[PDB]
């Protein structure tokens, strides 16, 4: 098959989606075919749609969803609120498995952070990553607390032998501060820091985003993600 990356993060609202659109855009401009997948989508009644936003920003056409829930809460709670069920583990794995093609990078965004339940019983993105033998890209903040949460997540991946593809700082302030700079320096000591997307990257139009995406990642690391 090809190259599957779950794009997780240290929590909700850390830039997972914008990192998916950014790595996809950079991969695309490098010649890579790119699929982006969002198996569990909460908050649709407030207009949350990460797939739609990834296409808006990077022009990705190959966009796969499965389960959708109106309320902006944990998938488990969003589902029970609507009288609906969470997808089964094998439904998520099948959705991804179908996208996987040689020479294609498939990106899988979770809901919130690594151990949020996506399927009953207690099935997380970590288990999905194990089933499709994926590596995990961990989107982190530069804010304080980030180091505790990053190391908690890297430990959670390594306990299941899910390989860490690295970190992406999902928002980077221009210019940083003392904590923001110490965080970055401390992050880059326990894991490779693939990118640092400028804050507000989610407001850039096509070209700027594509310009940002290409400079945001080391072209060699991208093109090396999928042979």
Ligand X SMILES: O=c1ccn([C@@H]2O[C@H](COP(=O)(O)OP(=O)(O)OP(=O)(O)O)[C@@H](O)[C@H]2O)c(=O)[nH]1
Strand order in the sheet with 164-172: 62-68, 33-41, 104-109, 3-9, 135-140, 164-172, 193-198
Q: What minimum distance in Å lies between the beta carbon of 53 and ligand X?
A: 7
- Spatial contact of 193 and 187, defined as CB atoms under 8 Å apart: yes
Q: What minimum distance in Å lies between the beta carbon of 6 and ligand X?
A: 13
- Cα separations in angstroms, 129 against 68, 76, 116, 168, 184: 20, 19, 13, 18, 26
Q: Which of residues 1-20 bind Mg ion (CB under 5 A)?
A: 16-17
Q: Binding string to its own copies for residues 176 to 205, with x set by CB under 8 A, is what? A: --xx--xx--x-------------------
- How far is residue 129's CA from residue 152's CA, in Å, rounded to a whole number? 17
- Spatial contact of 127 and 90, defined as CB atoms under 8 Å apart: no
How many residues are recorded in the chain?
227
The answer to the question of residue 113 lying near its own copies (CB under 8 A) is yes
Question: Does 78 show up as a binding residue in the annotation?
Answer: no
Binding-site partner at residue 223 among ligand X, Mg ion, its own copies, none, CB < 5 to 8 Å by type:
none
- Which of 4, 36, 38, 225 is the catalytic position? 38
Active site residue 38: yes
The answer to the question of residue 16 lying near ligand X (CB under 6 A) is yes
- Spatial contact of 124 and 6, defined as CB atoms under 8 Å apart: no
Nearer to ligand X, 103 or 149 (CB): 149
Given the rule CB under 6 A, which residues bind ligand X?
Answer: 9, 12-18, 50, 111-112, 202
- Supply the residues annotated as catalytic: 38
Give binding residues for Mg(2+) as ranges: 17, 50, 109
């Amino acid at each position: 098959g090809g190259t599957i990356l779950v794009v997780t993060g240290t929590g909700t609202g850390v830039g997972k989606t914008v990192v998916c659109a950014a790595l996809a855009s950079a991969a695309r401009q490098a010649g890579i075919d790119v699929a982006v997948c969002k198996p569990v989508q909460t908050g649709t009644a407030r207009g949350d749609d990460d797939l739609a936003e990834v296409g808006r920003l990077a022009g990705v056409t190959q966009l796969a969803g499965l389960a959708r829930y109106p309320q902006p809460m944990a998938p488990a709670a969003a589902a029970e609120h609507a009288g609906m069920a969470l997808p089964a583990r094998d439904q998520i794995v099948r959705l991804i498995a179908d996208l996987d093609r040689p020479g294609r990078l498939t990106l899988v965004e979770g809901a919130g952070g690594l151990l949020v339940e996506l399927a009953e019983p207690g099935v997380t993105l970590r288990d999905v990553a194990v089933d499709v033998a994926a590596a995990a890209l961990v989107v982190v903040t530069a804010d304080l607390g980030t180091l505790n949460h990053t190391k908690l997540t890297l430990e959670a991946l390594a306990a299941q032998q899910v390989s860490c593809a690295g970190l992406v700082i999902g928002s980077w302030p221009d210019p940083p501060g003392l904590v923001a700079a110490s965080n970055r320096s401390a992050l880059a000591r326990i894991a490779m820091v693939r990118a640092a997307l400028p804050a507000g990257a989610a407001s850039l139009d096509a070209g700027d985003f594509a310009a940002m995406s290409a400079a945001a990642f080391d072209r060699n690391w991208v093109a090396g993600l999928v042979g």
